[PDB]
Amino acid sequence: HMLELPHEKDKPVAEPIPICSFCLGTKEQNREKKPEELISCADCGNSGHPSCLKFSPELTVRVKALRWQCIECKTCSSCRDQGKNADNMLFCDSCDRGFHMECCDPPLTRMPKGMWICQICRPRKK
Amino acid sequence: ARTKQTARKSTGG
Ligand SMILES: [Zn+2]
Ligand SMILES: [Zn+2]
Ligand SMILES: [Zn+2]
Ligand SMILES: [Zn+2]
């Protein structure tokens, strides 16, 4: 399964809003007018079709297993703050958690060229 | 890689 952080496990989960914040469709109608279950933000309840969020099927399965925050609610999993600069918070390509570049270990100052994954998602070494 | 900023742009705002 996907590992949860201790602070995620016991947090309140917002009532989910049963329509997509991007296209205004319910689970019955994504942008292609096809059924598609929503992913919902645990902080504000805003939802999105995975297709409208531009998630792959593989990321979708993983995010559905976790306490996920929407793009606007995303807070850094290390310091727990938003901070003022949005091009500074990376989103993990394995679990979609946010981390400020400055909060990575070691800190980053430049964008990775390809995928980026957080320390939670990197496996333990032999 | 993605950031909050690129995700907003990718998904429409
Ligand atoms: Zn949608
Ligand atoms: Zn939210
Ligand atoms: Zn941080
Ligand atoms: Zn991750």
Numbering used by the authors:
A (entry chain A): 190 to 315
B (entry chain B): 1 to 13
Show passages lifted from the paper.
The developmental regulator monocytic leukaemia zinc finger protein (MOZ) also known as (MYST3/KAT6A) is a MYST (Moz, Ybf, Sas, TIP60) family acetyltransferase that is required for self-renewal and differentiation of haematopoietic stem cells. In addition to the MOZ acetyltransferase domain (referred to as the MYST domain), the N-terminus of MOZ contains two tandem PHD fingers comprising the double PHD finger (DPF) domain. The structure of MOZ DPF shows the typical globular domain of a DPF with PHD1 and PHD2 each harbouring two zinc atoms coordinated by C4-H-C3 motifs in cross-brace topology. The structures combined with biochemical studies reveal how MOZ DPF manipulates the structure of the H3 tail to sample its modification status and promote its acetylation.
The DPF–H3 complex structure was solved by SAD using the anomalous signal from the zinc atoms and served as a search model in the structure determination of the DPF in isolation and in complex with H3K9ac and H3K14ac by molecular replacement. Unexpectedly, the H3 tail adopts extensive α-helical conformation in complex with MOZ DPF in contrast to the extended conformation of H3 peptides observed in other complexes. This helix encompasses residues H3K4-T11 and spans across the DPF domain. The side chain of H3A1 inserts into a hydrophobic pocket formed by residues M300, P301 and W305 while the N-terminal amine forms a hydrogen bond with the main chain carbonyl of G303. H3R2 engages in a network of hydrogen bonding and electrostatic interactions with two aspartate residues, D282 and D285, the main chain carbonyl of C281 and the main chain amine of F280. Interestingly, H3K4 engages in direct hydrogen bonding interactions with the main chain carbonyls of I260, E261 and K263, an atypical binding mode for H3K4 in comparison with other PHD complexes that was also not observed using the shorter construct. H3R8 also protrudes towards the H3K4 pocket, with the guanidinium group forming salt bridge interactions with E261. H3G12 and H3G13 break the alpha helical conformation. No interpretable density is visible beyond H3G13, indicating that H3 residues 14–21 are flexible and do not interact with the DPF domain. In the unmodified H3-DPF complex, the region C-terminal to H3G13, including H3K14, is not in contact with the DPF and is therefore also potentially available for acetylation by the MOZ MYST domain.
